[PDB]
């Protein structure tokens, strides 16, 4: 069986037993993260050792631990006590969320703030939000959550329509104390509802949409073996799932004649951050590391056939751990299917008389997650021509505030008195490269304009240049859309039939990167988001661009610390980290529920093949 | 009958008859362009006057004429003789293309050049290409085509595999004279074939692709009336076709409650240019304006069901003129259909308990043209949420040359000895805007970064700014991907319920623009392509960014001449001209037939609606 297979319920049960038995899972303990470790470099020819990594919280205040377990052998390999003030706090527990609202509900300062605004405490929902690190000395080493209030008029009401501005609270979810309640002044609570299933708002549902039926009478063209191994139109890969990262692709390879050719060893979205750009002290601390602080995998939706995923769908149902180490299945959490993708190649030739058309298609691997008000879909695409693409789809309900009477340079008006603070959604794709194997390098390619003159008398010439990134200190790069800048990953020791190194070219969307001031806390904690492309030398323990414990960690962790090692990356085992994001100035059309917007990137073969790899695609019926 | 209906065969025949009756279409005359004119501003209530514009060429060398005819009234409205040396030659006639190879076959200089290379003239194809304007004074006022040679080994051979470098000829297609044959020396003619239907090159065809069936059991959701009027999911528009521009969209509007709200009055691709970046004298003159010089509409393919267009397809079969004024149908030249487009909106709310998912779809209107080795697809999309998008798809066989022994800074190697000169494919979308009517303005929107300090103590704030373009002199704009630059077209006299002007936001891909030296002929002739965005005041005779007559025409017409008028565009009837293109450094993967690559743009509503316009979409089955 493959060492890249999905974790089983039984494996999670075994982990639980090992911990309990070792005295590491007492009643005050909680599992904040649990996931299988990938195989070490060079092991496929050694006996498998399924290992799991676990972060263990203690609700009684004791120090948390990082533990590594071997389920194959039934042992604890390592258990280290964590100093959270130094290395960071553990991810937020799903169970700690409800705690903010409950604690506030009996706090005199909070109740006084609600009384001033004539709000029934029973109707006030509180969003349990990550704290970050600012000027509050007493917070260092404490697990803090901050809370913003929203009014829910009735059980099925959308509370996002009714933010309570001018009020914020801080809570210690371990000592269960309210550390601060800040009331900067009363703002009107927006009164219009945002109930998008209410006929009064939707009006009569349209009856004009006729069905579109998408079927595959002989079934799908892909095969799934060993639970999660996919083969499709020359492509080979394994679909992993981790509670923090979500869907992870392993061993992406392409079968070129009689050779299975590696392209990417591991692909994942290794972090994603949502920084807010409203300077009000009510929200100025607001930055959500959806991946690193909340763990997007654990909140993956069950995807419904015909609504979420359309066509001939093959599902995976990944298993994760709950807080106590019990296995929990996410039914139909991953969708797999192939889609038509228009014309692949076409030419009608006058001279030969040959008219030729071929159709394209893509393999899709997706999941969808919900984090409070946001919902994000993560889509990986494999195309017939060798192209690999990622796309994030952002939807959900916008995070809201009051709209100030005088207007705002940092907030949009969505409805009367209803504001939506400006923010970004910024992702980091970690691509552990393996172009024809692990000996890889990256070049930055810019188009080069040429001056009219000798050797270019008509002034029509243009060219391009490539710069090898040889050391990590030179490998922090920025976009330059104006010069058509891309990055090529190649294997200097593997050449195509024209004697050029095989390569793949990364095409970025060139959206803005992190907008915050460089001296800001968020710029330090999300340093990765300040630049478009980073290249590091592969290492076991360098997994996330923000480090292992993002919650309430002071800046510098992750990429900035990795890069500081200044390792050789010229013809070596390397990792590309691409930052890409949406900058969101919410529009009226985003309310009361927002239409999907998208961002992503793709990689196209660049002299990887000896000619088109789709000449053997047959004519369509 | 709608004044925006497609031209009928009868109308074209009637234009022929009116021209003949007027003495303007004798046996030496040829129609180089013929198209219906759009209704004048403010004519909606006035009765139908269908008028046609015609460019008439004379094969005896007399001066050509531009003529406008009223087919309704049976009259010549205007007829003027053209001085082509000044204002430009007429578009290339389909009949002139074949003249080049025919004449060269008997030219002693051409025969000697072929003999030097041991090539059989009977097997030498000549690509007949637009000439542009260079240092050859004898070409001024003459209709010239330039020819580049390719060997075709047998009737079904792809000649593009066998370019004959070091050789080019110039031909006067009216006097039937070879004006120049330039031979800069013998290059090896690449020997490998590029026959993508030959089993020896394709290998065994895949048997792994299972069928994807897309059907609509109740038929499509759009209706077609009056021949070309489309209504679909609140959208209303008319699909026109013009021999020069191809598919043209008219009267794009969206039904919002009771009101039919205009958005775009006319959308077209008003020019495209393909400049080559190889400084070899054999190709340094090489640029074509497929739209302006060749007329892309006339080379539209007939699109095959299940191959070119998949699903429930409604076709239009537009009619054009032949060279003598006889009508000719392009059977199935335009495909129209709707397609699923993933998730439209989705939110699973913990507090309300409501899980909500809706699906997206788009209406597609497309055609595909073939000119020489190139094949271009033009796709317009309308989305449920009010988004409008255009996409160009480039495929075909790349234009080849020899690959120089020492390598090249301006040409890629595709196969042994076979090169592909660098080039661009650049489009101009002309958007005659009508956001809620004709009173419009354009603002450039940039993200604004803020400095940490008073009022922004945590350094998280970010903002944006909008700059109104008030006069044509300040309306020639460039991309700035780094600052998230977009352009908003708004109506300052039509406000949403929040008292803000309704608008649409143009999102560009921010690809490189024209790379040629600003001193080059191509930079003058394709001036529009040097900047990303232009805004003009609407005028009847301002149709193309390159002017009416592009063939062998120097600078002096088109956008730079229009802009000089410095007209008020702040709350006026305005037109947006957006430049966007591909910069193509050909890859081995592009050979022997290239996979589709794409480029485009879209516009999204920006406070146009008072809330999401898709709340009335029903749950899918
Ligand atoms: Br315990
Ligand atoms: Br209340
Ligand atoms: Br999907
Ligand atoms: Br910090
Ligand atoms: Br005549
Ligand atoms: Br020959
Ligand atoms: Br289509
Ligand atoms: Br010129
Ligand atoms: Cu957002
Ligand atoms: Cu090209
Ligand atoms: K065991
Ligand atoms: K008539
Ligand atoms: Na690697
Ligand atoms: Na206009």
UniProtKB/Swiss-Prot annotation, chains A, B:
Keywords: Copper, Disulfide bond, Metal-binding, Oxidoreductase, TPQ. InterPro entries: AGAO-like_N2, Cu_Am_Ox_Cu-bd, Cu_Am_ox_TPQ-bd, Cu_amine_oxidase, Cu_amine_oxidase_C, Cu_amine_oxidase_C_sf, Cu_amine_oxidase_N-reg. PANTHER family: COPPER AMINE OXIDASE (PTHR10638), COPPER AMINE OXIDASE 1-RELATED (PTHR10638:SF86). The active site is at residues 290, 374. Homodimer. Belongs to the copper/topaquinone oxidase family. Catalyzes the oxidative deamination of phenylethylamine to phenylacetaldehyde with the concomitant production of hydrogen peroxide and ammonia. Disulfide bonds join 309-335. The modification 2',4',5'-topaquinone is found at residue 374. Substrate binds at residues 288-299, 371-376. This is Phenylethylamine oxidase. It comes from the Bacteria. The lineage of its organism: Bacteria, Bacillati, Actinomycetota, Actinomycetes, Micrococcales. Pfam families: AGAO-like_N2 (PF21994), Cu_amine_oxid (PF01179).
């Amino acid at each position: 069986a493959s060492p890249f297979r999905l974790a089983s319920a039984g494996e999670i049960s075994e982990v639980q037993g090992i911990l309990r038995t070792a005295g590491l899972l007492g009643p005050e303990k909680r599992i904040a993260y649990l996931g299988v470790l990938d195989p070490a470099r060079g092991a496929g020819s050694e006996a498998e050792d399924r290992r799991f990594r676990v972060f263990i919280h203690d609700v009684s205040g004791a120090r948390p631990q990082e533990v590594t377990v071997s389920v194959t052998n039934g042992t604890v390999i390592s258990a280290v006590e964590l100093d959270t003030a130094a290395t960071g706090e553990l991810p937020v527990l799903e169970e700690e969320f409800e705690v903010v609202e409950q604690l506030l509900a009996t706090d005199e300062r909070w109740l006084k703030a609600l009384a001033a605004r004539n709000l029934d405490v029973s109707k006030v929902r509180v969003a349990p939000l990550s704290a970050g690190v600012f000027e509050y000395a007493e917070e260092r080493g404490r697990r803090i959550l901050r809370g913003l209030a929203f009014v829910q008029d009735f059980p099925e009401d959308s509370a996002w329509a009714h933010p309570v501005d001018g009020l914020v609270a801080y809570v210690d979810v371990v000592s269960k104390e309210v550390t601060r309640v800040i009331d900067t002044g009363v703002f009107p609570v927006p009164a219009e509802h945002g109930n998008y299933t209410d006929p009064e708002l939707t009006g009569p549902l349209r009856t004009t949409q006729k069905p579109i039926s998408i079927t595959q009478p002989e079934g799908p063209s892909f095969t799934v073996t060993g639970g999660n191994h996919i083969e499709w139109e020359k492509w080979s890969l394994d679909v992993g799932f981790d509670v923090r990262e979500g869907v992870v692709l392993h061993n992406i390879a392409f079968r070129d004649g009689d050779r299975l050719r590696p392209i990417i060893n591991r692909a994942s979205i290794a972090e994603m951050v949502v920084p807010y750009g409203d300077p009000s002290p009510i929200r100025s601390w607001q930055n959500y590391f959806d991946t690193g602080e909340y763990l997007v995998g654990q909140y993956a939706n069950s995807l419904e056939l015909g609504c979420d995923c359309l066509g001939d769908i093959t599902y995976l149902s990944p298993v994760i751990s709950d807080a106590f180490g019990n296995p929990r299945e996410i039914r139909n959490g991953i969708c797999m299917h192939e889609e038509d993708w228009g014309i692949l190649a076409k030419h009608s030739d006058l001279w030969s008389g040959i008219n030729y058309t071929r159709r394209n298609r893509r393999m899709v691997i997706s999941f969808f997650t919900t984090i409070g008000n946001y919902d994000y879909g993560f889509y990986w695409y494999l195309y017939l021509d060798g192209t690999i693409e990622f796309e994030a789809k952002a939807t959900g309900v916008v995070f809201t505030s009051a709209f100030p009477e005088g207007g705002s340079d940092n907030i949009s008006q969505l409805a009367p008195g209803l504001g939506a603070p400006f923010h970004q959604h910024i992702f980091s794709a970690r691509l552990d490269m393996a172009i024809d194997g692990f000996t890889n390098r990256v070049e930055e390619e810019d188009v080069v304009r040429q001056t009219m003159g000798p050797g270019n008398e008509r002034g029509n010439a243009f060219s391009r240049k490539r710069t090898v990134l040889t050391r990590e200190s030179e490998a922090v790069r920025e976009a330059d859309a104006r010069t058509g800048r891309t990055w090529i990953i190649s294997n200097p020791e593997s050449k195509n039939r024209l004697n050029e190194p095989v390569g793949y070219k990364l095409h970025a969307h060139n959206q803005p990167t992190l907008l915050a001031d460089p001296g800001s806390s968020i710029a330090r904690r999300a340093a990765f988001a300040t630049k478009d492309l980073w290249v590091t030398r592969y290492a076991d323990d360098e997994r996330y661009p923000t480090g292992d414990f993002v919650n309430q960690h002071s800046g510098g962790a992750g990429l900035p610390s990795y890069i500081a090692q200044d390792r050789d990356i010229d013809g070596q085992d390397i990792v590309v980290w691409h930052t890409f994001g949406l900058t969101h100035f919410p529009r009226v059309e985003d309310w009361p529920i927002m239409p999907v917007d998208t961002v992503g990137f793709k990689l196209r073969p660049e002299g990887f093949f000896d000619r088109s790899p789709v000449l053997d695609v047959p004519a369509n019926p």
